[model samples]
Every structure is written in C-alpha cells, then in structure tokens.
Target: TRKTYTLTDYLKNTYRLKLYSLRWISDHEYLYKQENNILVFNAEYGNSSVFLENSTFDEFGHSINDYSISPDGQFILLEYNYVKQWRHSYTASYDIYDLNKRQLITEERIPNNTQWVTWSPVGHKLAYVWNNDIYVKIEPNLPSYRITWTGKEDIIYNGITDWVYEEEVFSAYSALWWSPNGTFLAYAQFNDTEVPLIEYSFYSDESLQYPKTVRVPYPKAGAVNPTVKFFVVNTDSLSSVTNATSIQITAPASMLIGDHYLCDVTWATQERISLQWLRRIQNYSVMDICDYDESSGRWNCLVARQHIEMSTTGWVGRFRPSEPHFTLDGNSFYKIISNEEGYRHICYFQIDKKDCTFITKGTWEVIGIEALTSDYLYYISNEYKGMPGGRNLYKIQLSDYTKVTCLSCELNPERCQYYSVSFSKEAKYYQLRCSGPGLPLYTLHSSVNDKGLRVLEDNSALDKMLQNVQMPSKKLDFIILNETKFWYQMILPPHFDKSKKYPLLLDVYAGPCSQKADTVFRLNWATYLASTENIIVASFDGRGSGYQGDKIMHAINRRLGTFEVEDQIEAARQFSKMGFVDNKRIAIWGWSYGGYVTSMVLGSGSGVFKCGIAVAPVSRWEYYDSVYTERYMGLPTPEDNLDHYRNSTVMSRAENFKQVEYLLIHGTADDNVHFQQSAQISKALVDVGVDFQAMWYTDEDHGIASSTAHQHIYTHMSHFIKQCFSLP
Candidate 1:
C-alpha cells in the first residue's frame, strides 16, 4: 500500500479534506455528496450505495468552487457568477438545497461574490459576507435579513471586513461568530473610504487584440485608513438594519485614525465578545481586547491596551493570530501561537477576570496547541530534550500547568507540520494534519487506548515518503550582532567535502513569521544543486523570524531592512572567514519579502554579497497593502516616517548602487506585491544609468506558477548563478 504510488498521485488524492478515526468518534465523517454530478459510495468491505447529484449548469459551467455544506449536513450552499468585471470579478447567486426533503431550501442572488460561509453553532441560521456587508439566511419559518449594510464602500462594513482587516488584522474572514447557544452574532465594521487608493490599470479590448484602460481602487502605505468598529447583531430583530444606529452602538465607529484593522473577534459566551484591533499607520501597534455586553448593550475593555513598538527606522507588521480556543465553560482559554511575554508563547486569559497566564515559558516558542480535555493541553514547541532547532509534541496538565510530557518521537520532523490542531468534542480522540518543507500533507488519527496497541497512525503513502527522503541535519548556532546572540543555521552541501573550497548561495527570507532554518525536512534540491554545481547553499532565520517571540519578531519593525541586512551581513562575514567558503563568489536570492531584503543587502555598498536576485519584491512600502505594511512600518506615504522608509528602501538608494551584479524578475499581473515594484526599481536603475538583468511575466500573478514560464525563469536563474559563481 505504501511503495508503489507516485508522488503526484499521493499529493493529488490527499488534496481534499481528510478525517481520522478519532475524528469519527467525535462525530466527524467525510460525506461524499458529489461525484461528477452524481453521488456514490463504494464500501471497501460492504455493498455499494448511490445518491443523485443535482445541478443546472453544463459540465464546464457547473459551479464547483461555489458550494458549501451545512452544519448538520442537511443542506448545500451553491454560488455562481453572472458577471465578470475588470477588477470586481465575482458576482454570484447563492442557492441552497435540503438533503432530507430533496428540495430547494432557498435561492438568493448575492452580490460581490460571497466567501467564507459559516453556519451558527445551531443549524437554524447561516451567516455570509459580500463586499463589506454581512448577511444572514434565516430558518424555514423566518425571512432572510441583511445584518449590517455600511452601504457600498463608503462607511465600508458591518458584518464583513475590508481587504486590510481580512488579510492583516483578522488574518482570515471578517464575519463574526455566534455563541454556542446562537443567541447573538458578532461582526467587525470598517470605514476605509478615506484611505487613498493605490491605483493600477487593467487592459481590456472588445476585439481581444489591443489593451484598454480600466482603473481600480488600491491603497498603499501611510494612506488615510478605514476606521474600524465592532458590533453584536441581534438576530431577534424584526427587520434588516443597514443604518447608522447599528454602528452607533459601537462608539468608535466614527473615529478614524492611522490605517487600522480589526484583527480578530470571537464570542466568549452569550453575554460577552472579545476582539483585537491593531494600528499600522505607523510602527506602533495596539492589541486590545474589547468585551461587549448583550444585556445592557455596554462594551468594556477586559485587558487594558497592550502596545507593540516598531523601529522608527524599518518595515514592520503584527503577527497573525493563532487559532483561538476556549475552555468548556468558556471562561479562560488560550491563543495557541501569539507572541506575548517578550517571546512567542501560548497565552491563557480569563474573560471576566483581568489576569493573563503564560502556560509554557522559556526560550523556545510554542508552534502549535491542542486542548483535548479540561486538564490536558497538547502542544508542539521547538524544545526537545537533546535536539535543537527541532519541533516536538508535548502534553501538559492544565490544572496547575505542570507535569509536561513529550508525546511524539524526537526525530520525526514529518510530524512537525502541525500548524494548528483541533480536538474532538468527546476528548477521547483527535485528527492531525502534518506539514513541513516540500512535504505533502496527510491526515491521521490518534487516540488514548487502554491496550498496548499503537495509538496513532497516518496515511501509509505519506509515512513512506518521509522514510524515503534524505533528511538534512541541523544544529543550533548563534551570530553576535551588537552584543545580541542572534540565532542562525549553516546548511552544508550534500556529500560535503571538508577539504574543498566552494562557492556559496545564500537563501534568505526576512519576513515576519517565516522560518528558514534547516531543521525541517530540507529537500534534496539544495544538495542536488551542490552535487550538480559543486556549490554550497546556506540559509539563516534572522531577526523577525517566527518561533523566537515578540521582542525578536518585532525588532526589525519600521527598520525592517536595517536589522535583517545587518544580521545577514554579520552571518556572511562570519561564514566567509572559514577557509572552505569562497567570499568573492557569494550570492543572494529571495522572493517577496526575501526579495526586498536581497535588494537591500546587495545595494548597501558594503560589498558583503557579490550579486543578488530578487523575485516579486516590494521596492517601496508605499506600494504594499495598507494592513500589512501599516502594521509594521506604519504609513510611509505621508512622509511621516520618511527616514525609516529611506533607510529600508533599496530603490531610495539607487544612486548608491554600484559594482554589484543584479537580476530582478516580476509578474505584470501580480496582485499581492504588484509588478509596479519591479517596474519602478528598474526605472530608477535605468534613470541613474545603471544596468541590471530583468524579466517580466505578462499574465502571471504572485505565485508565478505560469505553466512552463517558471521553468524558463528557473533556467535563467540557473544560468545567472552559474555565470556569477563560475560553477560547472
């Protein structure tokens, strides 16, 4: 069952959501309700069964992406688009079908393409968002209602969130949640109309031959931001209220400040709700938890405001929220992956009581957490008994937060991919999804057993792949920068020869929350490149990397380019001093945030790195998203923090660029980090009479996965690296 399957088949088959035996005991099961438009189940040891798949569209037109299953598994929500505009692409129709009655529940036309549909804790109602407003689908007896209608784009939102809120603040969808009793619904409201637009053109032609003009509303850094407000929509209302009165309940709705977004909101109980709001218009960030009262319609701050300071000189943003979990009584719980006491740690807080507890303390960071029972907390931290730079699963007793025990094996990096975990209601079993570098994910089941049988198992194919790949070795080392011991890793080439001198390739990403250590399953690609070209590839997780904690993670804020470049330069100087590394042939390469760091390192005029290659880099924070860039560097457009922006931006120092070889590539259609970044940098270089190699993909987006396009690009990269290092 494990040996014969191709890697592609294993990856593709496991793409769908999976369930484990433990999940099954928790009342979780895979309901295969669709099959090429028909539903059929062929039991492995029993008989075959069938069910009809109903649809109105043609085979090609069938809406596969716009379908959702109800909580009770009794209805399917179907959505379809009727129009395709230039930038506003999705305009859809949401329809529902009843499984039991084999009839239509209710079909409704929803505008602005709804995403992230959620059913209330009770299956009586459903909540969804379109554009910035939140809508509700009532049960059989009640009429559907529009919860909050901040109107079309001006006042901005009610139930739904704007772009910055979803991407940077909340890190997910905006529509709030209903209590387990389904009494009240919580949502975030945004007012981003004042935020200046980061405009770009879209080419459209009726004849499909030439390009035409189509402009969109885009927001860049430091621009006026959308005001944020939070609300608890009373479902017991007789009609929809898309008015100011609903927003008035949330007092700060009218107060606009530096671009701020609502990070997260969750219902602690039917009486109160908790939310986090952050400001990125400048380097300073405030994570506040607002508690909303349902009975008196009053809101109070549970935990006084917590501020995060970013450098007055670099780029910075807040870390994403780890999934939020509550105890059975909904009193005290934990936010699994947030950085709290100076380092990244799991924080436990009681709602009504104004006290916070750091359950897992020390130098290591908490990567994942799963609460199984009232007394047991299962988690993964990079703190193994004898292994450094490795992840291990541990269980701790929650009563006194003592008696921590390691559950998984020490050498299992494959099992290290648990980004987040969830426990079944019964607490007897759990399902797990493992993730790692270049490792395909697979789901598994684990349980507490009385007999001495194996308690955990995973997909045979995935386990076999892990056993086959050649795993890379890792060690915990440090680099001294200004008396601070910064963590780093030096990855040697496969079959490394100690006596030989080798050219080095430095792969770096200085983005927030990203780790580049070699401890995880390092693919044979670096080793293959080393064996094929006789070059060593080295990578390091500098400051601002995740798993370290808050202080290190936020150290580079507003001054992102400074700390990261200094750390990398220091690491390179340290490694180049070794006889085996050729300092004269050193090169650097990166994508997105890494690309920005690469450009900064090569252009700093220090001559530390010989050449640089950047992919989809942001030449200026003024070109990045309002939420992400604002969270870190604050706003850069108003020239408020111009000095920090100047120190961090390579494009600003185009006049200082000399003697360094550079090759920059970007996609013209990139939405995340726009192509304008590369185009502007290229223009700056050309205007200063500087020449560097460049490439642009016409129809590619952020990922740059454009068919054979990436192969050609990689080929160009290979040629460039070979020429730079003079490698075979």
Candidate 2:
C-alpha cells in the first residue's frame, strides 16, 4: 500500500535532505564532513576514523565553515567566522591544528577582512589575502611575510579580485596562483582608482536606524576600467622581507597601449607561465608564454602562442575563452574551439608549435574534460544518439584519436541517462553522479575493471516517497523553421486531454550560449503548475541557445534584443497553432538574462504574449559589466557601434508595454545585475504612462535565495500568473 504525499512533505523530506561534503585524500582514502565532525574513510580497508572532532570547534563559538588538509597530512586548517561580501568574496578566520598532536597549533586572524586562503600542493605552506593584500606563511609556526603593502580601499588590490573581475573574469575570489613546485608565487595587482563606485544601502532588521551605505568599485560598460599587472615572487627570498624580489611580467607593448583584461593566468611549470589577455572590446585576445630567468632575476615574454580574433558572427568562446588544460609533462595543452560544423571540439597544441590539431570531431560539443591520463582523455559530451540535451561520459586514446569509447552509455540504461563524474588523482577510481530521467543515484566505480565498486547513494527513500504522487509527464521535441531546428520541452498536466484547451506559459532565457531545454529531472514550481493548476509549462531554446552549435548560439551577437526577442515571439506563435493551446491566454516569464529577454519580447509589440514576468533584467548594455556586455555587443561606445546599442535597449520600447500586462521584479541589494537596471525600466514605464506591477525584495541579492524570500517570491509569481490567465 502507498500513501499520497503533499508539497510540504516533499519539501521536508526530499528538498531539505542534507548531503555531506566529500574530499579526496588519496586514491584509496577520502574525507567526509557531517555536521561538525570530519571523517576519513579508507576505501581499500573499508574503515573510517574521526579526523576532526566537533568538541574542538565548540570552543570557538562558531562551527567549521570550511577546511583543508595539508599535503603531507600532518595538519588540518579550519575556516570559521564566515561573513559573505558578494557572490564569491567573504571574510573568515582560520585555525591550524596538528594531526598527530590533536591540538590547535596556531590561529591567524586577518585584520579588517579576509578574502581568500589556499595551501601549496607540495608542502604545508599557506598563502592568503587580507584587506586586498597578499601574505604567506612558509611553515605553520613561522612568522608570516606580507608580499604586498600597497593595498588600499577601492583603489589598489594586491591578490584579491575587484567586483567586476570577480563577477565576470576570474569568477573566483582570489587572483593569486602558486607554482607547481611551490618555489614561486604569481599574483595580480589591480588599480581601480579611476573606476566608478556603486553604492547601496544595507538595512538591518535588528536596528531601527537609517541604512548603512556600502560602496564598491564597479566598472560599467564604456566606463573607466581597472589597470591589471602580474608579478612573480620567489619563495626563497621571503626570508629577507626588505629585499624580497618581485619581478613584473610585462604584456605586449600593443596590449598596454589600449584597454585590455587579464582574463586567465596559468603556471605551466616552475619557470614558465601562460597568460590570456583580451582587448577591451573583447573581440581579440592573445595567449602569451613567459619564462622566468633565475640568472637575470627577470621574466621575459617568450612568444605569443595563439591569436584569437572573433568575427562579426560571435564572441571568442561560448562566453569566455575556455582555460587551457596542460598535460602532465607540461609540453602540450588542450583546449576547445569551434569546428566547421560550429561545434566545440577538443584540440591539441604543443608548447613549441604554432599550429594545433583537432582531436575530437562531431556535430556536438565536448561539454568539459573530466580527467586526463598519459594516454587517455576522459570527457563528457552529448553526442550519444545525437541527443543534444543528453549527457554521457566518453574516453578517447590520445595516441589513436579514432579509438573512442562511451563509458556510461550501457551503465543502467533504464535507470540513468544524465551523468557526471569525479575522478581520483590518477584516474584509477571515480564517483559517478547519476542525475536522472528517473530518481537520482550515486555510485563509485573502478577504471581498471570498469565495474561499480560501491553504491554511495541510491535515493531509494525518495523513490518510495514519490510512488503515490501523481506527477506530470515531460515531452521533448524540436521545431524546424527554415532548415534550423529549435528544441523545446513541455510539462503536460497529469492525464492531459488532447481536446481540452489549456493556458500555456513560456519559460525563457535566450541569452548567448544558454540552454534551457534538457533531459533532467526537476521538481519545482513548474511541476506544481502542471499537476495542480492544469497549466502546460514549456521551455524553448531558440537562437543564442548553446550545445547546438556556434552558428545557432552566436546568431544574436551584437544584436541582443533582435533575434532572441523575435525567436520567443515566433515560438509562442507556433505554440498557439497547436490544438490544445489557448491563444489568448499565452504568457511568458524569465530570470536574470532570461528576465531581460522576457521584457524585450513583451516590449516588442508582437501581440503574441498576453503578459510577462521579468526578474533582475538588464535594461541597457551600458548598465552591465565590461566583460560580459562587451563579449556580445562589443565596446559600448557611440562611435564604435551606436546603432546596435541603441536598438538593443529595452527602455526604448517602454511604450509597447501598454499592449501587455507586465510584472517587473528585482532585489534591491542585487550585487551582480544591480537593482539600477530594473529601476531604469520602472522609470521609463512611469514616464511613458504605462501601468505595470513592480516588486523589490529588500536586502536580497541577485539570487533572492533565502528560504523565506524564495517561497514568498514564488507564491507571489504564482498568484500573478494565475491572475494573468484569468483563473481563480
């Protein structure tokens, strides 16, 4: 016998289930943290031990936020007192404890703020960023040395990324890297004195006083950008703090003359480094190789390895250039680039050669490289049976490119389809994460025998809980228009009837390289709408959608609101032609870039959509950051591409909103998209005398992901959507 479950039950049992953190200590050993205790598990021995106890952390008045094990396994570093600043930046206090002694050895506190901390791969050496400056500790008990003393508020940052770089370029908090041998350290210095400051008010519920103003250095499009420079420090010279030598690795003279960005940095070896620099417009980029000369105590640019120039068709990469992955020997590297079919395939290049060879070829893209061995390369792709939305694991022999084998294709065909993997250090074993077309499951596998070694998580409890639930069915299909295939997915109401007319809701996010329609299991608001409200929820991946090819994904380059906006309207028109869809009740909704598309489609005056909801949308390219905006629209300058910028803005068509109902939503404290984008849209609507609904989540960021905020916002949206459909 089975019992039906409610939404509240699902939220408590399935949605709120806790998954502990796992870290690989070696091929046979790993560490797992549950609550406050860190447990070390030995796979070979099938035993576990308490690596760190909760009692030690109880004394600090704070729980262990994160931790790292030393390379030699003699010590463990604990991070606590975490205070989040933005998406990636945070402040935390650290404590190091000896493993054998089982006692806290030292506690390092960074004054003002702590941005990031990392350990060397070879030894117990640690490097961290405090107040935007870099510091190093050669040993656990040794005195720390300050690498840079020029860090200042909103002006100079030594080893930490600024707001713009953190969000768009590095996508990380720290901009410092250590050499493979731990003999040298490389760091970035950012000078943002000329950049504009973005200020917001922080409101506290505990205090009934005025909000505190917080300022950040942010570079909008066409605004003054931070100047970046790279430097290398020899760890041996750290003993003499006054005479520590820091050599500058200069970029090409041509790059220095104009505005550019240090997009990527890599330590190829102990003495060699590789850097990627992009022009301000982001249309052109250069990959340079540099060598450190010990005799002269200087770094010299050896050569410019690759020159990437993007045509009018699209940006260099899907969004940014994929970072180069080096081989174990460091003599060659591999990267993903577009082929003749517009698909992204792996390519191999030698350090001394000027040309590259295509390794994997197909109409589908290599999503990412998982692990690389001496002769074998493991990767994830959707080339299985030409299903663009399906993911499968594959292995290829480097020596013989034709020798390719699909690893996860035959592994439980009925139970698992979407797959991801995490490999051990030597690729001897891997953890297979099987997310589904069915209930999700996790298993550990061995590469040598190609067999499942252990079942990590079967999610059998969730399976049992869902047996009595009446769930909606999902259908995947594509629409062919002018020889172009655009894919879409639909969630039909439970036991749907073909003759009955139903309201349709379009879930859209048509940004460049964005894919919304996929074969994955999800239980969210869409499911509730279909199962309870009897509404058909659909997602269409039109132009600028990724995983299809570069041609389709980059079709909207330099014209953000043109093709992407038109595609959504056309998709809606096509859906309206179906017998089950009610043409007068069609609506659309999106978030982030999707929000921008939602607004543009409604403001297009297409008369297809009856209403739309936009959350945290960008109104103008000039209002966004430099790296992301310039990649699609080029430099935001009047003389360079004035017509493109003027035509792509949603504010210019605010008068068209009178034809449709609109709900604009934003978080007042959004750090990424900024509330200013939506504020401008509201102002334009007011000036044009258009009556539209607006909602602001106070003290919430871009995600608006707090439990209370998440539930409230979804409820509000659900109510508004139902009202738009004219259904109680």
Candidate 3:
C-alpha cells in the first residue's frame, strides 16, 4: 500500500533515472547509446561493439538529431534537423557517415542551416559555422573553406555565441576552437554593433492575428556591451591558401583599456595557447600565455607569460575565471583559486612561472579541476567530513602534496556523498557521477589502479521501482548563520514524523554563485511537494550561497537585495524554530536567480513568509543583463554601484508585497528574465494596491520550460502550493 510520489511521478517522467551517456573514444574506447544502437565500449572490458546501426539511420529522412564520432576513428557525424537556438544555440543538418565507406556521402553535402560543427581534435577535419561564416571541411566528402568575411546577420558574429555570448559568456554555442594538432582554428568574434535590441511579444495560438515582435541583440544593465574579437586560423592553410588570413588574438594591454571578455580558451600544447582576459570590471583577470611562432606565422604574448587573476575577493572564478588545466608539455598548470583562507584551493602553475604553488589547501572548497595527470591532480571537493553539503572525489599526489586521496569518500558511506567525475581522454578511465543522498549511482573507475571498474548505472531499475514507492527523504543539514555554517536542504515527508507539525516549503535560490544546499539526488518539484503534499520541502544556503568560502561567498558583494534577502528571512525564522516547523505554514519559491530571491523573500514584510513564488523575476538592476547584472551589481550609474543599485529593488518592495501571499510569475517571451522584469513587478503591485497571484507563460522563456508550459507551470505551482498549505 505504498504509492505516492505523484504529480504523475513528476509530470510523467515517471521516476526514470538511468544515465551512462558516454563519448570518450580512446584511452581504450567509449561511445555508448543503446536502443537504436551505437555501442563501442571497452575500458578494461565491459565489451560493446555495434558502433552505429539502428538501421544505420533508417534511411536518414530527418529526425536523427545527434551523433558525432570521428577523432580519427574514421567518420560518423549525422546530426539531423535540430533547430534550437539560444541556450547554447543550435541549427543542425549534417551527414557524412562513411565508416570506412559503408555508405552515405554524396560529395559536398552538409549545408542547410548548419550553424556550428566540430570534429578536428586530430583528423576527419571539418569545422563549421554557416552563414555567420567560418567553414573549412577538407575531407568529409570535401570542398569548403571560407573562414569569415565579417559574418553579419544581426551584425557580425563569425564562429558563434552572441546573445550575450550565448547566455552569459560561453555557456557555449561555439566560439569554436580546435587546435591540439589539427593545425589551428581558434575563434570568437562577437560585435553585435552596439548591442541593444530586446523587443518581445509572441502569443501564437487561438490562430494568432498579430503578435510576433521578437528582436534580440540584448544588453541592458548600463547599456552597450558586445564587441569582442580574438582569432587564429590556419587549418593546414585552407587548401593552397586563397586569402585565408585570421591571426589577430590581441586583448591585454590591461584588457585593451575597457570592456573585455574572451574569458577562457585553454589549448596549451601543439605550440601553446591559453588566453583568458575578462574585465568589464569583473574584478580583473588576464592569463595570456600564447606562443606558436614558427618563424613569424605569429601569436606571441609574453610579458613574461602574463598570468594575473586578481578579484579583490569575489567574481574571478566561481563564475568567470578559473580554467587552466594544461601541462601535457605546455609548461605546467592546475587552477581553482581563492586561497589565503578564502578557501577554493589547488593553485600550482608554471607556464613561465610568477611564483605559483599551493597544490590544494584546506577549509573545505576545491570543487573542480577534475583531472590533470602527470602524477595525479583530479578534484571536486568539500573536504567530506567538514561537509558543506558534501561531494568528494579527490586525488592530489603531484609527487606528494601531502598525497591526498579520498576518491569518492568511502564509496558507500550511506549511498555516496555527491560526486560527478569523467576523466578518460588519456587519464586512463573514470566516471563516478554518484549524485545523491542515495539513488543515482553510475560507476566505472580503473585510474590504472583506483580499481572498481563496473556498475555503470546502479539505479537498480530505480531501486526496484523505489521498493513500492512512498519515497522522499534527504536531509543534509546545517544552519547557524553568521559565525557562518548556513547550508540546508530538506525534502522529508514520506513517513516522516519529527514529532509531527510540518508544512514548511522554502525552496529559494539565493543566487550569486548559488548552491541550494546539495548532496544532490532529486525527483523534483520538491519531490512532488514532499511525496504528494505532506509538504516540508526546504532549502537554504544563505548569505550569497555557493561552496562555503569567499567569506561565505562574498557576503552579498555590493549588496543585492541585502544579505540574500536577510538570509532567506533568517532561514525562515530558523525553519520556524524547528520543533517540527509550521509557524503558520511557511512558504517561498523561486526561479531565475530564484525569482530574484523569491521576490526578495516575498517583499520582506517578513512576518516569516506565508506565501511566495516569483518565476523569471529580476525587477531592477537596470532590468538585468550585461554579463549577468554587472557581476554582482556594479555599474548601474551614479559613481559605481549606484547606491546598491538604488537600494536593491524588487520594485522597492511594493509596500512589503502587501504583507505576504504574493505570486507574480512571468514569461511573455522572457528571453532571459524579461517580460520587462515581470512588467515592473506588475507595475509596482498596482502602485501598492497589492492584490497578488499572477502568471503569464504565453510564449514563455526564462525556462517556463515549454512542454505545455512545463506542465502548465508545474500545475500552476501545484495549485499555488496547495492553496498555501491548507492542503488537501
């Protein structure tokens, strides 16, 4: 008689959790895809072989949507008609096939809508990016070579990413790269001629009669920003060089004296590379490195190999800087910064040294740098026992930087403490990916001898259909606030009876590196609002969240909605002084910077929340954008931080959202937080006449994630959070 994990198992996704999703292709093979075939496995033997043959694209009449394989394992490519765009853009249509001539390649084909393609880490050479220029082919059924002519289409963009570098600096949509022995290509070229566009309106349905505005270029926060540049090109001299020329690279004379950003690039060997840059006052960053001279075929950079990362304590890595693993003979590297006690460890550099050293320090943070080799460096942390919402997988060694170790903290210390690894592309083999306070396992290891080489997916049929259901538990605790501990997470509900009382909810997303307390695992919508409405839910993280460090993540640096909305209303008055919560049934919600911290904790009338929601929110910081609200509120006028951007607005609290129970969701084609920031928070809550609950979704965006508006905005926010907990 168990049941209950409803909302139709989260809108029909039915508890399904199984993932192995691979792609490596060497250091002993990889690939996988099953059902509709495409196998290829083999790292220390869990054999697999059919590499492609789900009726070999059943006569490719469109609808393949993905596939790529040639890194010298002789050609595959496929990808059919995708057409997505924005949120890492898309525009598919490609073909190639020919696994040693088993067919499909009627010469020069790959055309229609193309927009960006790769495969060239060392052979099968291709490089694409259509109408916005940059092409190259060489042999995938040949003939092509164009590489830029000032691309232009919403004003020049070349190898991709514009729309604020495809949603804030390289959350990717190709800015292309390729050189690790495919003879150079590197890219980046934005411009968007003086940025500014935005528009909106979409509607469609009810047989639309007029409603399609759309536009885009976007910029906002203190205006005009897109300009970038950087380049490289050589691709084996694009067939007998016919006006090839790309070179450029530039940026770094103190970031060409103003707004800059190419952020990172990497490469390192095959004649060095690196890059980095930054500065739009995102607390300085530089890096550079470069090299590939080969007698004036240019690419220099060496005011003694550059480097510098600065940050005066906040935005230089956790969201923008830290990326430089290198060292396969490109003169040493290993990044993850912020040390002198502001935690985030692992320093080690050398690409022409500037002192460098730290190998990994303490007070718990190191969360990334996952795989470096030359005698180990791997990473991902929260030093286990000091918890910080766990996450293990270590390694270190680098010839004894106190040896380190902890690879997935004792493996099953009660179903893993969050992991996420990957490795193999020569670091022998690794996968890990645990994610949980229990179920999502997925293994495979053998970093030569770190052993355990199997169990790829241990959701044992989702733990045998969740042993007849009724599941919902997760706790991962902590809350002290100021003397610092913070981290929180709850979910609970199943047969939970912390001496009864319940009804809480919280679930906010106090953004700024954010981190809603984690040890991962989730069946979401707070697992059907704590298993079909017993309602505990919770989540806290506090003062500008994120891996405990940067003095609790730069305590709301330049203050944005003050101390993350008074530490989520002091973590909901300390989760209503525990004794099984329920101080008038608390509530809160979020989305998009946790809906601007759930509309600044339901407008801070703070009689400890009794209702909340705020999807796609922002309502200020000059209507958001400009590389994410000037990285923690900076230039919105009047001498720098513009008086905490006019006292961190959510429409100046619109009279404390008339004391609680507010809603205000949005998405009239959001295009990243913009139904005009919830139409200026519903015109300042109708100029303070307050009356609440509102939604929009028509032509949604800012992830009101369409699938019928993602189950009609989570079943209208689970009937407005079950009528604000009067439940039933």
User: How does each model score on TM-score?
Assistant: 0.80, 0.95, 0.32
- Location of the lowest summed lDDT over 10 successive residues in candidate 2: 11-20
How many angstroms is residue 471 displaced in model 2 relative to the true structure, after the best TM-score fit? 1.7
* True-structure RMSD, every candidate: 5.8, 2.2, 25.7
| Candidate 3 lDDT over residue span 354-450, tens digit each | 8788887778888888778788878888888998777888887888898788978997978888888887788798988887888888888889889
Return the clash pairs for model 2, or none: none
Clashing residue pairs found in predicted model 3: 152-156, 591-594, 591-595
630: Cα error in model 1, Å: 3.9
lDDT against the true structure, per candidate, is 0.60, 0.82, 0.83
| Reference-based lDDT, residue 686, model 2 | 96
Error of 3 at 87 (Å): 14
**Candidate 2 stretches greater than 4 Å from native:** 1-21, 34-36, 44-47, 107-112, 206-208, 304-312
Model 2 residue 425 lDDT score? 65
